[PDB]
């Protein structure tokens, strides 16, 4: 009644796109630690039951195609779909190695009118990537085509997204530990909300620059879901 | 459902909090904006719901842009120490990232900023909720047949529609989102978590509603609301 139906042969497909090294033209640095993120993610989402595949250093055309294909696959025996983007980013756009592409362009392939097999099923996107230059200085019948999506961004619109080259990204470590522990017994919003809490609290940046010292982060969930979602 | 200790927003405060409703029905000729028939109905329903939840609700009417900012900034400067949370609900014309006063347009992000961490210390670690009934663009959903804290934390925006899309409103029955919202809030407002409620409002607006117009450009259209949460705990209005 108030839950998404999970009675399907497979949980669903999980495309993880891991972008580490970029073309010199985009002039964007190597994202160190992103390999830590991907492997940890691969475990969790696999352990949840997703059929996860990891694609490394994709180009924008490559990403668009990856998604479009999956969009055109047959999802009749799937409960849901999940995509995860690890990259450099700006507002509304994510980086391939050869430039940028709008996030909406990657997602819209799964709109109700463009992926019938995934209608009334959750389509989940998790996006760990910078979202702008800002720093949090801290303190003290028919259904709509845009429905059933959920984007969990690593950060709020306009703000930087922090990643340690040694331990991986703040967001990912958090999402992984919570999932490694309650992925099976909590609802998706409960899970993400705790991730919001752990990133907000447990983390604080440290550099030798005063502009980047003791800075903060809060992830941001967008939901057009229409049911509660549990992975079991 | 199971209520697990260090995971709820602490509600044991003298008061639930302020709920400011901004009911904009009438707009200057120069904005080219029309009379939003249905909105008085929407405002009545909402103020009763939020009163019933226990908010101290205040209704403002046909606001200028300056007024909208002023009352919000001043609201942001009151002493919320004895409140568990704050709510603001905007009913107006809107476009991508902006919302109308009677005399023009002002960025939503600029309204909400007043209640940040560094800017409104007495609402720190407390949920600040924002409900927005307004168009966010012109596109139509045609449908388909079956210690330290970040300054931006503890905000939840519940928009009536997705970015870039239209927002529907019966002159007779009021906007879909609002109708749906108030209904769910009546039943389960005191027994369901905020995200559980808004999800149900998502389902209801998506199913129960379909447009009907003599204009085929506007005929048989659909709508999905959009929830954005920077909350760090579950939020229940009771106990």
3-state secondary structure A43-106: HHHHHHCEEEEEEECCCHHHHHHHHHHHHHCCCCCEEEEEEEEECCEECCEEEECCEEEEHHHH
Contact B105, B98 (CB under 8 A): yes
Question: Do residue A228 and residue B199 have CB atoms under 8 angstroms apart?
Answer: yes
From B222, which residue of chain A is nearest by alpha-carbon distance? A144
d(CA B43, CA B231): 26
**A105 Cβ partners below 8 Å, 6+ apart?**
A64
The domain B1-239: what is its CATH number?
Answer: 3.40.50.1460
> Which of the following is catalytic: A80, A83, A130, A176?
A130
Partner residue opposite B152 with nearest CB, options A218, A221, A228 = A218
Tell me, what DSSP letter sits at residue A209? Answer: S
Q: What end-to-end distance do the CA atoms of chain A give, in Å?
A: 16
Any idea how long chain B is?
239
Residue B9 gets which letter from DSSP?
Answer: P
Determine contact, residues A121/A47, Cβ cutoff 8 Å. Answer: no
Asked if B151's CB is within 8 angstroms of A137's CB, the reply is: yes
CA A10 to chain B, closest CA, distance in angstroms equals: 22
CA of B53 to nearest chain A CA: how many angstroms apart?
22
Cα–Cα distance between B93 and B105 in angstroms, integer?
A: 9
Please check whether residue A108 touches B, CB under 8 A: no
Q: Cβ distance A183 to A231 under 8 Å?
A: yes
Q: Which of A140, A144, A221 sits opposite B141 (nearest CB)?
A: A144
Instruction: Identify the experimental approach.
Output: X-ray
Any A CB within 8 A of B139 CB: no
Asked if A219 lies within 8 A of B230 by C-beta distance, the reply is yes
Q: What's the burial of A92, exposed, middle or buried (CB within 10 Å: 0-12/13-18/19+)? A: middle
Q: What would you report as the CA-atom Rg of chain B, rounded to the nearest whole angstrom?
A: 18
Close Cβ partners of A209 (under 8 Å, ≥ 6 residues apart): none
Closest residue in A to B7 (Cα) is: A194
Which of B224, B225, B227, B235 is best to mutate for the A interface (most A CBs within 10 A)? B224
Tell me, in Å, the resolution of the deposited structure: 2.8
Exactly one of A88, A109, A115, A176 is catalytic; which is it?
A88
Q: What 3-state DSSP class applies to A190? A: helix
Look up the CATH number of domain A1-232. Answer: 3.40.50.1460
Q: CB contact, 8 Å: A142 with chain B?
A: yes
The answer to whether B125 faces chain A, any CB pair under 8 Å, is no
For A142, the closest of B195, B222, B234 (CB atoms) is: B222
Alpha-carbon distance B81 to nearest alpha carbon in chain A (angstroms): 15
Please indicate whether, in this complex, the C-beta atoms of A222 and B226 are within 8 angstroms of each other. Answer: yes
Going by C-beta distance under 8 Å and a sequence separation of 6 or more, which residues neighbour residue A94?
Answer: A63, A85, A87, A88, A100, A101, A103, A106, A127, A129
Q: Tell me how many degrees the CA angle A172-B234-B125 measures, rounded to the nearest 5.
A: 85
Q: Please report, for residues A36, B58, B172, B180, the alpha-carbon distance to residue B183 in angstroms, rounded to integers and kept in the order given.
A: 46, 20, 16, 5
Burial zone of A74 (CB within 10 Å; 0-12 exposed, 13-18 middle, 19+ buried): exposed
């Amino acid at each position: 009644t108030y839950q998404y139906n999970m009675n399907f042969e497979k949980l669903g497909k999980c495309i993880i796109i891991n972008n580490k090294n970029f073309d010199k033209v985009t002039g964007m640095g190597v994202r160190n630690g992103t390999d830590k993120d991907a492997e940890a993610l691969f475990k969790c989402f696999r352990s949840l039951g997703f059929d996860v595949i990891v694609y490394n250093d994709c180009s924008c055309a490559k990403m668009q195609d990856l998604l479009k294909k999956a969009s055109e696959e047959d999802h009749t025996n799937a409960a849901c779909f999940a995509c995860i983007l690890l990259s450099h980013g700006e507002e509304n756009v994510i980086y391939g190695k050869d430039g940028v592409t709008p996030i909406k362009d990657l997602t819209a392939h799964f709109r109700g009118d463009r992926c019938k097999t995934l209608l009334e099923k959750p389509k989940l996107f998790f996006i760990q990537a910078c979202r702008g230059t800002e720093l949090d200085d801290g303190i003290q019948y028919k259904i709509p085509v845009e429905a059933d999506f959920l984007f969990a961004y690593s950060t709020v619109p306009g703000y930087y997204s922090w990643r340690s080259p040694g331990r991986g990204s703040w967001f990912v470590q958090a999402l992984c530990s919570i999932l490694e522990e309650h992925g099976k017994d909590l609802e998706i919003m409960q899970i993400l909300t705790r991730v919001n809490d752990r990133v907000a609290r447990h983390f604080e940046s440290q550099s030798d620059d005063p502009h980047f010292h003791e800075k903060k982060q809060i992830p941001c969930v967008v939901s057009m879901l229409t049911k509660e979602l549990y992975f079991s």
